[PDB]
Amino acid sequence: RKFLEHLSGAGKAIGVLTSGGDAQGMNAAVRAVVRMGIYVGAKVYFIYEGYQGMVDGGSNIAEADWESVSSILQVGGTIIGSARCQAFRTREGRLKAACNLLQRGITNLCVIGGDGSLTGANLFRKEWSGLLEELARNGQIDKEAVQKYAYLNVVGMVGSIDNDFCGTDMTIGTDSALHRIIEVVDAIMTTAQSHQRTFVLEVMGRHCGYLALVSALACGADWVFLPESPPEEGWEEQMCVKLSENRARKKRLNIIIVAEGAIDTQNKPITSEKIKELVVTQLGYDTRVTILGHVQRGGTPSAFDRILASRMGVEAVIALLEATPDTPACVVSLNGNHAVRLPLMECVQMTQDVQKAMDERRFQDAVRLRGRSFAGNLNTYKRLAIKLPDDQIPKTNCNVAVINVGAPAAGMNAAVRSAVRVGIADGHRMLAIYDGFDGFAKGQIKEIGWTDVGGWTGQGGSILGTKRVLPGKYLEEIATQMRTHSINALLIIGGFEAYLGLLELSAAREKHEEFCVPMVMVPATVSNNVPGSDFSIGADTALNTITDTCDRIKQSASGTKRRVFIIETMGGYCGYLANMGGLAAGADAAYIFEEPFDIRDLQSNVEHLTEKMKTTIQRGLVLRNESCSENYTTDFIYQLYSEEGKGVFDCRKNVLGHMQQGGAPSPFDRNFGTKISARAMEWITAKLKEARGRGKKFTTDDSICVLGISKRNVIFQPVAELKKQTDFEHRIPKEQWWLKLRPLMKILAKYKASYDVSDSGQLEHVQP
Amino acid sequence: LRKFLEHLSGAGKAIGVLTSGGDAQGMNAAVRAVVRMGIYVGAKVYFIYEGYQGMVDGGSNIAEADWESVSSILQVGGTIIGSARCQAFRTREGRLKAACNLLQRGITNLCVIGGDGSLTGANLFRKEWSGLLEELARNGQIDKEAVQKYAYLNVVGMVGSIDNDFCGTDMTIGTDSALHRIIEVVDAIMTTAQSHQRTFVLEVMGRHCGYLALVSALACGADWVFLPESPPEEGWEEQMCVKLSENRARKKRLNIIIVAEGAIDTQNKPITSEKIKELVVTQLGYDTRVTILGHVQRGGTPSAFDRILASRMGVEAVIALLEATPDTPACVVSLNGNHAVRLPLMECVQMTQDVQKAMDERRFQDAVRLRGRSFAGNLNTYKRLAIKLPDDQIPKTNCNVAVINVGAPAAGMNAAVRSAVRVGIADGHRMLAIYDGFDGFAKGQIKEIGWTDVGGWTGQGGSILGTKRVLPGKYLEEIATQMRTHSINALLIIGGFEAYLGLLELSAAREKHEEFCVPMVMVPATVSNNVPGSDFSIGADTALNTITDTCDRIKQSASGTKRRVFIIETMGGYCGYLANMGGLAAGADAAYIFEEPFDIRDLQSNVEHLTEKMKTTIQRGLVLRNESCSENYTTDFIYQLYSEEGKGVFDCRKNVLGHMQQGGAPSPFDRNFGTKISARAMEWITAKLKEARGRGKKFTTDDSICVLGISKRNVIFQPVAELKKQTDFEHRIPKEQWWLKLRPLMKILAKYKASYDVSDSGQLEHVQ
Amino acid sequence: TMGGYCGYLANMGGLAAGADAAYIFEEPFDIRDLQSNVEHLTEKMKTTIQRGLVLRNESCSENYTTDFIYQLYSEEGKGVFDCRKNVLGHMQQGGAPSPFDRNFGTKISARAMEWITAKLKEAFTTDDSICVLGISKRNVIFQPVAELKKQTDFEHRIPKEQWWLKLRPLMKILAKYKASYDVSDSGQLEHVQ
Amino acid sequence: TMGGYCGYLANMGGLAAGADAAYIFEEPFDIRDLQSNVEHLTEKMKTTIQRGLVLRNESCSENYTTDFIYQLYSEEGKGVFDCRKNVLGHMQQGGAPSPFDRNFGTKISARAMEWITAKLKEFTTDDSICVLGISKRNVIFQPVAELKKQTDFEHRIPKEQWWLKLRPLMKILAKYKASYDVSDSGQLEHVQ
Ligand SMILES: Nc1ncnc2c1ncn2[C@@H]1O[C@H](COP(=O)(O)OP(=O)(O)OP(=O)(O)O)[C@@H](O)[C@H]1O
Ligand SMILES: Nc1ncnc2c1ncn2[C@@H]1O[C@H](COP(=O)(O)OP(=O)(O)OP(=O)(O)O)[C@@H](O)[C@H]1O
Ligand SMILES: [Co+2]
Ligand SMILES: [Mg+2]
Ligand SMILES: [Mg+2]
Ligand SMILES: [Mg+2]
Ligand SMILES: [Mg+2]
């Protein structure tokens, strides 16, 4: 162990500022920093207008209290304000700034911004000692103060919708921007026209095609323009050719995603207008083009971003405390869902190298410099967008069947599309099993083609159909179908039942030979209870459904009346939704199953919130997991809070229900589904090659697994070794990672909870 | 004396429908209506793809349409028929080639759905008709006798363009939808927080029409607007910058400038958005971003208003097309004050050209008047609320006018209060805000509200002032005391049915308590739309859109091979407005309402009827139910019935919208409705109070306690006293509900055989 | 009434209390049959009867619940009679046993023990070591659990052939309905033994 | 139990059946009192008692419903006892009247008629419209007009309910420590 309230920061003064362009989630970030600091006993200060406000000093720097960051979670942009400071580019600016900082006793800094803000911060750390000299020399600071305020603790959070700070995987604001983007695309896709249409959409990304890329495989674009993998000479005709080909496959709406910094093999800008003319001239299709403006910074921050920003705010504060005089200025980030600290300079460096690599037309290097992830997504997108002519795909004469098992989860279709195509592209013959195991036993199996899964990416529900019935009772019939259709591998995109399903099948692989094939499961349920994966397809979508409902509930006025909302969430026994949703929507409490409670705890939380309602808060929020308790039902809690609040606030109950489980999948899920399904198929492909084409009998333990997010990677884990770490009575994993975050959500609600911060991040170097 | 639809057969006639010009949300709803209405009256309808192009081209561009052709296109933007620009039709050769293909198919009845252009072109085609048949018989391309048979061309048009540039038409299909798209963007920018001042320049559409720009402006309380009809006065550059800094000083941290495409100055010189950008960047230096909302204004799903409007017009077009004689002028079906009307094409085409002439000739004041009484008023109202005169230039009246919210919260009450408060202040009154309705009124919760206090209220949901359903009955003594102490001279209640009841009670008390002998106006605000004396309510459109939105989602989600039917309970109490209109807008098979009693037999019949549709044509069925349509046949009852009867062919899903979606953000239509009536109501109070000073403080007459509502074709003030006659106080709904005449439409559109009293249909009238 | 899927209680109770109808699982019904019975009883209420009775098995249908039927009969009766709903519930499952049961329990338990005594006097892996002492043909015979599987529906936990169902058409014609009555199992002359 | 807002049935029934607690409207309670009684009874269940009883007036509270209380006692009893809920309902409001009532009804109706008979031997006055009932120690006719003073028309129950003086009895008999105003106790009188 190494807890938080055993890491006091009493006496220290933290300054937080947001620089560069604004990005959804910044407020969530400062809210976390401010409160986390104040909680550990530190004293935090706001620094308006990014670096500008620091140079200017004076009132541009104010102390922040617990209520400063109150109710800004669901707010885009930044209440602190963010701008570009030209003065800070100069030596005079840095000096004037260091002075105001010293004038306020602030030696601990938290910079929230993009590649720029961060590299600038890095440099400020270097010149620190040097700036204090020049200041003491010119008699603007004390001669002894040059020793006290001698150590500058700097820590950064990447908060930009660009995602251009190489060395970091995810950044605050991107998922949100992606939402904005996909919302537009979706709005155009629900429009029907008889003639062929081509939509050219220009997203952001100065010299980074990340946004453009993820946007592309989020809506199955026909073509993408990235600054890292520019189009090969003679693309103009190639593109037009691809559009007409897709047009012939019945795709009546082409979508071209263009990055701002789109360029050709010679760094020449590829304008959206050039693309417009290109198709209007060559193909003559109804072409419309919109340059998604700053509107990509608008809207409310997605659930992903609010949570990410909160986790980072904590990481920034604890990092800032444990920082010694000789500890490198770092940048808190996340790697495979694990907190990590990366030294500023190392990142600022690689960031500049990627630019260098691109200017020097060494594009293949730029692509590799962005990250293993970026390179993979790029390939996966190409793989799914560009199909090779049938004759160039050496057949494997293997029939790979894909199926949906479990309750429907947003993004199952994106998953099936991805698996079917990667399969076809690998030379297999794809088979679709409808209505899960139920239909499997009833022989409802048919072949699916490349165009049959077109446009499935953004579709909610399960086009294939999905059931909760498990294979146990019908092991026979299935083994039969599996024989008469000559199935060589199985890809189940489902939930917990898919796992219980795989386990039953790996048991019968004893009494039945038809089951000795490779089988992978891909986690898909809003619950996020599949053993072996930290995330599920459809989980993000559901979480966003929650924050969306809470946003609305707040923005509505009740006059002088104080109101408290009790909201029941899905998840069965898994309080993931309830807990993370609670954190993301800023709830006072989130009753879950994993943390038992009695009438006393209940009474306590009511009094606690009743107090907040009497003063500071105007709108209270309480979440409750479906099955957190059988006696203390949603109504029970509603009734309790209602009676106890009499006179200070009234209640409103609200059960989200399972109607919001089939809406369109969020960008994050359409990409999650696309990505794992592809890695899973890749696995099947390879397992089959072990057969040499004359068929093998797969008996091994690791040939029936769950592909999931584990340590910091997407690793395949044999179903057999997952039993150990799973509670089959409540169908939830024995060790739930997100529970370590529960004490965070609490202290943010002004509670005093023990926070085991042992899993916090630690120094590491950028992986090349 | 009354005409019915099944009596006026069209058997033997052939109707051709086409969509021309730019696409506009609601066009599908329109052709769906035309196709089916035609097919129903026994006519035979034909599709004409690509607007006029397809007519010129002929051949397969013209196909017969059957009942299923227009199936499930209601919630679809754009047009499945396709719409384009035909250059060939601009020429005499085109018109000839077209008239030939039309004759070649026996189509002499035409329905053109498009904008100013498409329509003027249609008009001209009617003129040259006889002339074209000559030239065709002369060149032996048509029969000599056919020149007599196909001698009469029945043309009827529907204005379907997001511009609304066709003179003589109040509202056109597609505008409300475009406005939604626009306001969605604005709203997305407003939820973004920044510390420094920001200025957003948004360029909406409207070739040479500033309608869109205008309504967009008072839909979000813009700081400034640029219209082609009322260009800015010379020297505006500095004037604008001055207004922005002033607003900046009143704490408005985000300026919004709405610019119409055709924005021009007093000399027809184009006023670019980029010029506006620089103007503020240079003079004020605020963070200025500008987006040219592209074609994205035609995207998204068509709003409820547009789907309904388009359906009502589709019928009007068909019945008009039938009752058309050889000597009956080619007209354009439209709506005037919610009443169907037919306007002769030429008259409209004319005025349309006159408005352009008026603008080119810098006779702007004429252009403004040519747009319509409405347009001129909105323009004024917007200016009035956007430009406040300096306190000293506003002669005080020394009158205290109190504004209050009474009844269940309705989306847009805040827009209403903002509008009333400001118009009041601008009229020199001292404004008083009564919180928490009558409850707070009696408890003396009255305070003064200022011009900036209601800033940005336009787009806020719920009731900032607070609202209760309590009636002044039991607290006459308390309330009267409060008016007396606060010196309340006029009262403006923005609320629902209970607000009408309050007014009835207050009236009766003005005898005993003198303090109630002041003017009292009521403005209809409830999602129910049950206020006696008004065809519409503030918050009704918002609610209706909530319904169609939920139905859209429910459909777009796949269930595999499974057929699904949804039962949805709507609000409204006893008023089936929501249920019925929502049903029509979402395309439901049935909508059980209170106003139309039903028994188990009717129930059983509709189930069988829909069960049939599910077995074939439909894949997704929809059934709506009013909250209180019956006490025994509850939502669950109907769910259970349809469920059992569908066993084997489809499964059910139940869903109660609930009152949680009664406090979301108000739809554009409502923020403007609220703004508009509240202003007219205040104007009334101002005028009443001035004759106090002259005529006499003798406010003990029915005519001084009114309900401002949409009646005949105007917004007229009706004394509460004479409304009692026409209202059923037991169920709190008006005795005569206009929308019920539309019920038989919704039915026949669902493939039922219902008697349709089409007596209220439109008839030839000349534009005012 | 209780019974799960077994409409014994509902049916026999209906007969015993003189009910117009007894909706049970074993005899599926649709909205038409339902509508018919309402009209039929509505008629009786208009004249002869002053008090009408309708019984419903717990699980006779999942869509046509107790409330459903209550609501239907209520609406159709409007003007001629009002309804009252009432769920016996499982609270009246633990009252004192009726004379018949205290004697039934005493009697079989004794015969069963007698069997055990005789079996354990023989000293088991055969199918007759495990039975179900119960009333069959005309005797209390021991039947091996194994051969009972054949004649039982494990999905609804009720025997495949329920003897009392032959009595259903009786309860009906007594309610003034016209039902086919298979009276094949009727009695026939025998000699007293 | 029935009674609307009048906890007569709940209270007296509680006393008569020996219940641990009888939640009524006339005596407001909060979650703390509630929690206390559960603990108190949970204790008795752990030892002495084998069967516990709790009564609740139909409308004693709108938030702490019958189910609420059932759920609370159920959760707090987990491990020591289980719960069973039961709503008497209005079906047992039409059974045969008990001997006491058939005689009560017979007796007052007769005295009431006797009054009418006497009144008709000679009406715009206010003592001509009474309410015959049991008051002090007699069955006296009281004009409806003077009864308004002592009645709460909002919950339709008299302002002063005599049986409430018995409430503290039912409690101490359940082993609670309640203040018992025994002022109305009896005093030595001579047989009259
Ligand atoms: N090389 C640098 N040296 C000093 N300061 C810098 C440097 N680069 C950036 N900054 C600081 O950051 C400010 C804004 O830079 P920039 O726009 O690159 O930040 P950003 O966060 O990467 O922007 P974005 O949010 O759009 O990604 C500069 O005006 C300056 O104050
Ligand atoms: N004067 C005209 N004579 C013949 N045809 C015309 C004329 N004006 C318009 N049209 C027909 O309408 C087509 C499109 O014109 P236009 O774009 O003005 O229509 P619209 O309905 O006003 O478009 P929108 O919906 O964008 O306002 C023309 O290409 C032509 O086929
Ligand atoms: Co290289
Ligand atoms: Mg930034
Ligand atoms: Mg940057
Ligand atoms: Mg058009
Ligand atoms: Mg036009």
PDB file of N, CA, C and O in Angstrom, chain A residues 579-615:
ATOM      1  N   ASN A 579     -21.260   3.250 -11.169  1.00  0.00           N
ATOM      2  CA  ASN A 579     -20.096   3.913 -10.592  1.00  0.00           C
ATOM      3  C   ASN A 579     -19.420   4.913 -11.524  1.00  0.00           C
ATOM      4  O   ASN A 579     -19.274   6.088 -11.175  1.00  0.00           O
ATOM      5  N   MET A 580     -19.000   4.450 -12.703  1.00  0.00           N
ATOM      6  CA  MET A 580     -18.334   5.327 -13.667  1.00  0.00           C
ATOM      7  C   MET A 580     -19.286   6.426 -14.137  1.00  0.00           C
ATOM      8  O   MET A 580     -18.886   7.567 -14.376  1.00  0.00           O
ATOM      9  N   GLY A 581     -20.552   6.072 -14.272  1.00  0.00           N
ATOM     10  CA  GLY A 581     -21.519   7.051 -14.698  1.00  0.00           C
ATOM     11  C   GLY A 581     -21.602   8.089 -13.605  1.00  0.00           C
ATOM     12  O   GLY A 581     -21.629   9.295 -13.872  1.00  0.00           O
ATOM     13  N   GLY A 582     -21.643   7.610 -12.363  1.00  0.00           N
ATOM     14  CA  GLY A 582     -21.715   8.509 -11.225  1.00  0.00           C
ATOM     15  C   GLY A 582     -20.557   9.488 -11.236  1.00  0.00           C
ATOM     16  O   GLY A 582     -20.742  10.694 -11.056  1.00  0.00           O
ATOM     17  N   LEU A 583     -19.354   8.966 -11.452  1.00  0.00           N
ATOM     18  CA  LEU A 583     -18.160   9.795 -11.506  1.00  0.00           C
ATOM     19  C   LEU A 583     -18.276  10.822 -12.615  1.00  0.00           C
ATOM     20  O   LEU A 583     -18.049  11.999 -12.392  1.00  0.00           O
ATOM     21  N   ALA A 584     -18.641  10.354 -13.805  1.00  0.00           N
ATOM     22  CA  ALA A 584     -18.784  11.188 -14.997  1.00  0.00           C
ATOM     23  C   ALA A 584     -19.864  12.265 -14.932  1.00  0.00           C
ATOM     24  O   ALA A 584     -19.702  13.336 -15.503  1.00  0.00           O
ATOM     25  N   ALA A 585     -20.964  11.974 -14.250  1.00  0.00           N
ATOM     26  CA  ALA A 585     -22.059  12.926 -14.131  1.00  0.00           C
ATOM     27  C   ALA A 585     -21.977  13.740 -12.852  1.00  0.00           C
ATOM     28  O   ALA A 585     -22.783  14.653 -12.637  1.00  0.00           O
ATOM     29  N   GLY A 586     -21.012  13.395 -12.000  1.00  0.00           N
ATOM     30  CA  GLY A 586     -20.817  14.095 -10.740  1.00  0.00           C
ATOM     31  C   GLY A 586     -21.930  13.862  -9.739  1.00  0.00           C
ATOM     32  O   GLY A 586     -22.570  14.810  -9.284  1.00  0.00           O
ATOM     33  N   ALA A 587     -22.158  12.599  -9.397  1.00  0.00           N
ATOM     34  CA  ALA A 587     -23.203  12.238  -8.451  1.00  0.00           C
ATOM     35  C   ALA A 587     -22.680  12.221  -7.023  1.00  0.00           C
ATOM     36  O   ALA A 587     -21.500  11.958  -6.799  1.00  0.00           O
ATOM     37  N   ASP A 588     -23.563  12.509  -6.068  1.00  0.00           N
ATOM     38  CA  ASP A 588     -23.213  12.514  -4.656  1.00  0.00           C
ATOM     39  C   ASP A 588     -22.927  11.094  -4.183  1.00  0.00           C
ATOM     40  O   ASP A 588     -22.055  10.865  -3.359  1.00  0.00           O
ATOM     41  N   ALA A 589     -23.670  10.134  -4.710  1.00  0.00           N
ATOM     42  CA  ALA A 589     -23.500   8.744  -4.318  1.00  0.00           C
ATOM     43  C   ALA A 589     -23.972   7.817  -5.412  1.00  0.00           C
ATOM     44  O   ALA A 589     -24.850   8.158  -6.205  1.00  0.00           O
ATOM     45  N   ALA A 590     -23.383   6.636  -5.452  1.00  0.00           N
ATOM     46  CA  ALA A 590     -23.746   5.642  -6.447  1.00  0.00           C
ATOM     47  C   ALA A 590     -23.838   4.295  -5.762  1.00  0.00           C
ATOM     48  O   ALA A 590     -22.824   3.628  -5.582  1.00  0.00           O
ATOM     49  N   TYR A 591     -25.042   3.891  -5.376  1.00  0.00           N
ATOM     50  CA  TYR A 591     -25.219   2.618  -4.700  1.00  0.00           C
ATOM     51  C   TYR A 591     -24.997   1.445  -5.644  1.00  0.00           C
ATOM     52  O   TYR A 591     -25.693   1.303  -6.655  1.00  0.00           O
ATOM     53  N   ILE A 592     -24.022   0.605  -5.317  1.00  0.00           N
ATOM     54  CA  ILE A 592     -23.722  -0.537  -6.156  1.00  0.00           C
ATOM     55  C   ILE A 592     -23.714  -1.788  -5.327  1.00  0.00           C
ATOM     56  O   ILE A 592     -23.702  -1.725  -4.106  1.00  0.00           O
ATOM     57  N   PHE A 593     -23.716  -2.925  -6.010  1.00  0.00           N
ATOM     58  CA  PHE A 593     -23.715  -4.242  -5.377  1.00  0.00           C
ATOM     59  C   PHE A 593     -22.372  -4.595  -4.753  1.00  0.00           C
ATOM     60  O   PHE A 593     -22.306  -5.112  -3.647  1.00  0.00           O
ATOM     61  N   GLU A 594     -21.304  -4.315  -5.484  1.00  0.00           N
ATOM     62  CA  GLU A 594     -19.947  -4.598  -5.048  1.00  0.00           C
ATOM     63  C   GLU A 594     -19.553  -3.963  -3.712  1.00  0.00           C
ATOM     64  O   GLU A 594     -18.591  -4.382  -3.078  1.00  0.00           O
ATOM     65  N   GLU A 595     -20.286  -2.944  -3.290  1.00  0.00           N
ATOM     66  CA  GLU A 595     -20.016  -2.290  -2.011  1.00  0.00           C
ATOM     67  C   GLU A 595     -21.305  -2.275  -1.203  1.00  0.00           C
ATOM     68  O   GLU A 595     -22.121  -1.362  -1.317  1.00  0.00           O
ATOM     69  N   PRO A 596     -21.508  -3.302  -0.377  1.00  0.00           N
ATOM     70  CA  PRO A 596     -22.699  -3.428   0.461  1.00  0.00           C
ATOM     71  C   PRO A 596     -22.917  -2.235   1.370  1.00  0.00           C
ATOM     72  O   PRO A 596     -21.961  -1.623   1.840  1.00  0.00           O
ATOM     73  N   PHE A 597     -24.179  -1.912   1.622  1.00  0.00           N
ATOM     74  CA  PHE A 597     -24.515  -0.785   2.481  1.00  0.00           C
ATOM     75  C   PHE A 597     -25.746  -1.111   3.287  1.00  0.00           C
ATOM     76  O   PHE A 597     -26.541  -1.954   2.889  1.00  0.00           O
ATOM     77  N   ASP A 598     -25.897  -0.443   4.424  1.00  0.00           N
ATOM     78  CA  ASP A 598     -27.046  -0.665   5.299  1.00  0.00           C
ATOM     79  C   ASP A 598     -27.806   0.640   5.499  1.00  0.00           C
ATOM     80  O   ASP A 598     -27.416   1.678   4.969  1.00  0.00           O
ATOM     81  N   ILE A 599     -28.883   0.588   6.273  1.00  0.00           N
ATOM     82  CA  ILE A 599     -29.698   1.772   6.502  1.00  0.00           C
ATOM     83  C   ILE A 599     -28.932   2.920   7.152  1.00  0.00           C
ATOM     84  O   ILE A 599     -29.303   4.075   6.999  1.00  0.00           O
ATOM     85  N   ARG A 600     -27.867   2.612   7.878  1.00  0.00           N
ATOM     86  CA  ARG A 600     -27.088   3.656   8.523  1.00  0.00           C
ATOM     87  C   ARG A 600     -26.292   4.449   7.519  1.00  0.00           C
ATOM     88  O   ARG A 600     -26.304   5.681   7.551  1.00  0.00           O
ATOM     89  N   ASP A 601     -25.595   3.740   6.632  1.00  0.00           N
ATOM     90  CA  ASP A 601     -24.781   4.385   5.592  1.00  0.00           C
ATOM     91  C   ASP A 601     -25.719   5.232   4.744  1.00  0.00           C
ATOM     92  O   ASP A 601     -25.422   6.360   4.372  1.00  0.00           O
ATOM     93  N   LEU A 602     -26.865   4.650   4.447  1.00  0.00           N
ATOM     94  CA  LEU A 602     -27.886   5.291   3.646  1.00  0.00           C
ATOM     95  C   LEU A 602     -28.316   6.607   4.299  1.00  0.00           C
ATOM     96  O   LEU A 602     -28.350   7.659   3.654  1.00  0.00           O
ATOM     97  N   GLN A 603     -28.626   6.535   5.591  1.00  0.00           N
ATOM     98  CA  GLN A 603     -29.079   7.690   6.356  1.00  0.00           C
ATOM     99  C   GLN A 603     -28.019   8.763   6.364  1.00  0.00           C
ATOM    100  O   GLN A 603     -28.323   9.944   6.261  1.00  0.00           O
ATOM    101  N   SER A 604     -26.770   8.332   6.488  1.00  0.00           N
ATOM    102  CA  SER A 604     -25.638   9.239   6.495  1.00  0.00           C
ATOM    103  C   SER A 604     -25.522  10.035   5.179  1.00  0.00           C
ATOM    104  O   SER A 604     -25.400  11.255   5.194  1.00  0.00           O
ATOM    105  N   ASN A 605     -25.575   9.347   4.044  1.00  0.00           N
ATOM    106  CA  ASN A 605     -25.468   9.998   2.739  1.00  0.00           C
ATOM    107  C   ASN A 605     -26.591  10.972   2.488  1.00  0.00           C
ATOM    108  O   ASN A 605     -26.406  11.957   1.778  1.00  0.00           O
ATOM    109  N   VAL A 606     -27.764  10.680   3.037  1.00  0.00           N
ATOM    110  CA  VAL A 606     -28.912  11.559   2.859  1.00  0.00           C
ATOM    111  C   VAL A 606     -28.629  12.836   3.607  1.00  0.00           C
ATOM    112  O   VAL A 606     -28.776  13.921   3.055  1.00  0.00           O
ATOM    113  N   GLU A 607     -28.209  12.711   4.862  1.00  0.00           N
ATOM    114  CA  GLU A 607     -27.895  13.884   5.665  1.00  0.00           C
ATOM    115  C   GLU A 607     -26.798  14.691   4.996  1.00  0.00           C
ATOM    116  O   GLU A 607     -26.891  15.912   4.893  1.00  0.00           O
ATOM    117  N   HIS A 608     -25.773  13.996   4.517  1.00  0.00           N
ATOM    118  CA  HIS A 608     -24.649  14.632   3.841  1.00  0.00           C
ATOM    119  C   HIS A 608     -25.102  15.456   2.643  1.00  0.00           C
ATOM    120  O   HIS A 608     -24.701  16.607   2.490  1.00  0.00           O
ATOM    121  N   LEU A 609     -25.937  14.874   1.792  1.00  0.00           N
ATOM    122  CA  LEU A 609     -26.435  15.587   0.622  1.00  0.00           C
ATOM    123  C   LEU A 609     -27.464  16.647   1.004  1.00  0.00           C
ATOM    124  O   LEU A 609     -27.543  17.689   0.353  1.00  0.00           O
ATOM    125  N   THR A 610     -28.251  16.375   2.050  1.00  0.00           N
ATOM    126  CA  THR A 610     -29.269  17.318   2.494  1.00  0.00           C
ATOM    127  C   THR A 610     -28.562  18.591   2.895  1.00  0.00           C
ATOM    128  O   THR A 610     -29.090  19.692   2.744  1.00  0.00           O
ATOM    129  N   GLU A 611     -27.353  18.435   3.404  1.00  0.00           N
ATOM    130  CA  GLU A 611     -26.586  19.582   3.818  1.00  0.00           C
ATOM    131  C   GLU A 611     -26.153  20.368   2.598  1.00  0.00           C
ATOM    132  O   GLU A 611     -26.338  21.583   2.526  1.00  0.00           O
ATOM    133  N   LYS A 612     -25.577  19.674   1.628  1.00  0.00           N
ATOM    134  CA  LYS A 612     -25.124  20.339   0.420  1.00  0.00           C
ATOM    135  C   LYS A 612     -26.270  21.071  -0.262  1.00  0.00           C
ATOM    136  O   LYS A 612     -26.068  22.151  -0.813  1.00  0.00           O
ATOM    137  N   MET A 613     -27.471  20.494  -0.211  1.00  0.00           N
ATOM    138  CA  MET A 613     -28.645  21.111  -0.829  1.00  0.00           C
ATOM    139  C   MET A 613     -29.054  22.394  -0.117  1.00  0.00           C
ATOM    140  O   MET A 613     -29.567  23.320  -0.745  1.00  0.00           O
ATOM    141  N   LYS A 614     -28.824  22.446   1.192  1.00  0.00           N
ATOM    142  CA  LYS A 614     -29.175  23.623   1.979  1.00  0.00           C
ATOM    143  C   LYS A 614     -28.316  24.813   1.615  1.00  0.00           C
ATOM    144  O   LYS A 614     -28.709  25.950   1.843  1.00  0.00           O
ATOM    145  N   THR A 615     -27.150  24.561   1.038  1.00  0.00           N
ATOM    146  CA  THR A 615     -26.250  25.654   0.695  1.00  0.00           C
ATOM    147  C   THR A 615     -25.815  25.739  -0.753  1.00  0.00           C
ATOM    148  O   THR A 615     -26.518  26.277  -1.613  1.00  0.00           O
TER     149      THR A 615
END
